[PDB]
Write an enzyme that holds these catalytic residues in place. Sequence first.
Site, short mmCIF file in Angstrom:
data_model
loop_
_atom_site.label_atom_id
_atom_site.label_comp_id
_atom_site.label_asym_id
_atom_site.label_seq_id
_atom_site.Cartn_x
_atom_site.Cartn_y
_atom_site.Cartn_z
N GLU A 1 12.87 -24.18 26.05
CA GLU A 1 14.08 -24.34 25.24
C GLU A 1 14.70 -22.99 25.04
O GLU A 1 13.98 -21.98 25.14
CB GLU A 1 13.74 -25.00 23.89
CG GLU A 1 12.53 -24.39 23.20
CD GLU A 1 12.79 -23.09 22.47
OE1 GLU A 1 13.96 -22.79 22.14
OE2 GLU A 1 11.81 -22.32 22.20
N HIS B 1 18.08 -29.52 15.99
CA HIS B 1 16.75 -28.96 16.06
C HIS B 1 15.64 -29.86 16.57
O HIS B 1 14.59 -30.02 15.95
CB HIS B 1 16.43 -28.37 14.67
CG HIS B 1 15.23 -27.47 14.69
ND1 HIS B 1 13.98 -27.91 14.29
CD2 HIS B 1 15.11 -26.18 15.07
CE1 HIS B 1 13.12 -26.90 14.43
NE2 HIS B 1 13.79 -25.86 14.90
#
Length: 108
Positions: free
Chosen positions: A71, A100
């Site tokens: 990520e 998130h």
Amino acid sequence: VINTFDGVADYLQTYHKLPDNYITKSEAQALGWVASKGNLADVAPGKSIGGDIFSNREGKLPGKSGRTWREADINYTSGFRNSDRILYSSDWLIYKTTDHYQTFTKIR
DNA sequence: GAC
């Protein structure tokens, strides 16, 4: 600097790596970054955190033996980190989440 | 794997 969803997704698809303005957490930490201090832009001007492993423990992203997920921060300029991340697999599946890692959208 |  390239840190937008499309910009990074395109770069990743073309070169199979994150653009030069990304550093891992370990690299950032080595530079003096302290999460609770939100000092990234001061210790690493124009840099964004990216390239670390995403374990996909919730199983929200497509899983397959031997597939690794990573990520990277998106839309980061300064201060404390946001909720925007690009997710990319070793086999170049590309997803985005703006909350998130709670929900993801396939984008490339 | 915001912190």
